[PDB]
Structure 1
Amino acid sequence: ILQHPDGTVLKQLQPPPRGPRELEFYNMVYAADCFDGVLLELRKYLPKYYGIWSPPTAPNDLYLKLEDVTHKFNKPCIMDVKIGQKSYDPFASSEKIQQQVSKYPLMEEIGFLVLGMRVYHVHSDSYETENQHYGRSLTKETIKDGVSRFFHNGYCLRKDAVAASIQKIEKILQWFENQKQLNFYASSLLFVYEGSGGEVEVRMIDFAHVFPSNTIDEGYVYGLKHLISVLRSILDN
């Protein structure tokens, strides 16, 4: 993720087939001739897409130019949460499935995985960051506290941002409960709230493993519902 002063991020296409699939996902959703109500609604929950971008002198080098969802924040607090029971896709080999399940064997049980967070602390005027190993450490016993950490600014628990997050996730959940044409594996929700101020963003990202489907995305829904339940329990802290 390259953050550009103009309010965008550049995301480099991952190696094939992942990068190409993500490009084609954005292209389908943001097709200027799209009249599919499901895809038109989905746009609300993605970063705005500004098309494929390559350096003037390097057409080999493929990026997605995307909206920087954090741009309108002063001190953005950022959490990336992978959603679903499976982070392997329907065409994974047995080895690929193990690779993926072994990354976090609780994925089936919990339905989400914190990929990281960046949390502004007011008292120190500083950020604390958690990496992939944080979320992968979390168990049924510690997931609630693990998520809570995102909404603690070193003085209070930001229950406003928690409530706002539930409300925005609910709209995404509603989108998933009214579509049976896409299934999303290893995709994430990006949570942003203002650390320095009620603004909150919850957007879907990471579409290297979105596939056509004829079913509800039950794994994604499970994850959304479990994540909401956790956030809801945090409101009782």
Structure 2
Amino acid sequence: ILQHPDGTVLKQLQPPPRGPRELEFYNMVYAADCFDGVLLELRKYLPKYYGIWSPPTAPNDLYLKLEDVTHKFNKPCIMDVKIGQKSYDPFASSEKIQQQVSKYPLMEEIGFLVLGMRVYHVHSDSYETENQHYGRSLTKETIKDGVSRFFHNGYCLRKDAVAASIQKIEKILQWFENQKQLNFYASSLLFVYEGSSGGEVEVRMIDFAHVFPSNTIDEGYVYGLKHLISVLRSILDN
């Protein structure tokens, strides 16, 4: 992810087949002649898409030009959470499935995985970061406190940001309960709140290299969103 001063990001296509699939997902959803109500509503929850981009002298080098969802914030606190029971897609080989499950074997049980976080601390005027090994260390016993850490700043637990995140996730959950045409594997939610209010909170769906046509409810995604909502709700009682 390359942050651009004009409030966009450039996301380089992943190697094939993943990058090409993500490009086609954004192209399908943001097609100018699309009047599918399901896809028009989905646009609200994604970063705005500005099309494929490549450097003027390098047509080989492929990026997606996307809205930087952190751009309106002064000291953005950012958390990325992978959603679902399965990180592997319906056409994964046995080895691929094993690779994905071994990255975090609690995915089926918990339904989400914290990929990372960046939290502004007011007392020190500094950021605390967690990498992928943080989230992969969390279990049923530690997931509540693991998620809570994201909302520790301003000398307090930011229950305003927690409640706002629940309210934003609930709209995404409602979209998922009103569509049976896409299933999403290894996709994420990006959470942003203001570290420097309820509060400017942003919750956006990202990472679409494993989105497939479906005939059913995305049950794993729904389970993960619900569990994540339940965890967030329990943090409101702290």
Deviation of 1:153 (Å) = 1.1
Where in structure 1 are there 5+ consecutive unaligned residues?
none
Contact 2:161 2:198 in 1 (8 A): no
Counterpart for residue 194 of structure 2: 194
Residue by residue over 1:108-134, the C-alpha shift from the partner in whole angstroms, topping out at 9 and shown as x without a partner, is: 000000000000000000000000000
1:197 and 1:219 map into 2 onto residues whose CA distance is: 29
Which runs of 4 or more aligned residues in structure 1 lie more than 2 Å from their structure 2 counterparts after TM superposition?
none
Contact 2:53 2:63 in 1 (8 A): yes
Counterpart for residue 168 of structure 2: 168
Deviation of 1:156 (Å) = 0.2
Deviation of 1:142 (Å) = 0.2
Residues 129-208 of structure 1 mapped to structure 2, 5 A cutoff: 129-153=129-153, 155-195=155-195, 198-208=199-209
1:198 and 1:101 map into 2 onto residues whose CA distance is: 36
1:209 and 1:129 map into 2 onto residues whose CA distance is: 27
C-alpha change, 1:222 and 1:197, in structure 2 (3 Å) is closer
Q: What SS is found at the alignment partner of 1:202?
A: strand
TM-score of the aligned structures, taking structure 2 as reference length: 0.99
Q: What SS is found at the alignment partner of 2:89?
A: coil
Deviation of 1:155 (Å) = 1.7
Deviation of 1:198 (Å) = 1.2
2:134 and 2:52 map into 1 onto residues whose CA distance is: 33
1:103 and 1:220 map into 2 onto residues whose CA distance is: 18
Deviation of 1:197 (Å) = 6.7
Residue by residue over 1:1-25, the C-alpha shift from the partner in whole angstroms, topping out at 9 and shown as x without a partner, is: 0000010000000000000000000
2:161 and 2:198 map into 1 onto residues whose CA distance is: 10
2:185 and 2:153 map into 1 onto residues whose CA distance is: 31
2:87 and 2:100 map into 1 onto residues whose CA distance is: 6
2:176 and 2:45 map into 1 onto residues whose CA distance is: 11
Equivalenced residues, count: 237
Q: What SS is found at the alignment partner of 1:117?
A: strand
Residue by residue over 1:89-114, the C-alpha shift from the partner in whole angstroms, topping out at 9 and shown as x without a partner, is: 00000000000000000000000000
Deviation of 1:45 (Å) = 0.1
Tell me which moved more, 76-85 or 153-162: 153-162
Between the aligned residues of both structures, percent identity stands at 100
1:141 and 1:154 map into 2 onto residues whose CA distance is: 26
Contact 2:160 2:198 in 1 (8 A): no
Residues 1-237 of structure 1 mapped to structure 2, 5 A cutoff: 1-153=1-153, 155-195=155-195, 198-237=199-238
